[PDB]
Amino acid sequence: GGVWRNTEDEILKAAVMKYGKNQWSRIASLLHRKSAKQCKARWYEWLDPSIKKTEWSREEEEKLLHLAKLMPTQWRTIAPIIGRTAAQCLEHYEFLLDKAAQR
Binding site for other proteins (CB under 8 A): 6-8, 10-11, 14, 98-99, 102
Distance CA 14, CA 25 (A): 15
**Cα of 12 vs its chain's centroid, Å:** 15
Q: How far is the CB of 100 from other proteins (least distance, A)?
A: 12
* Residue 39, CA atoms < 13 Å, CB-side half-sphere: 25
DSSP 97: H
Rank residues 58 and 69 by Cβ distance to other proteins and give the closer one.
69
Rank residues 14 and 81 by Cβ distance to other proteins and give the closer one.
14
Q: How far is the CB of 83 from other proteins (least distance, A)?
A: 26
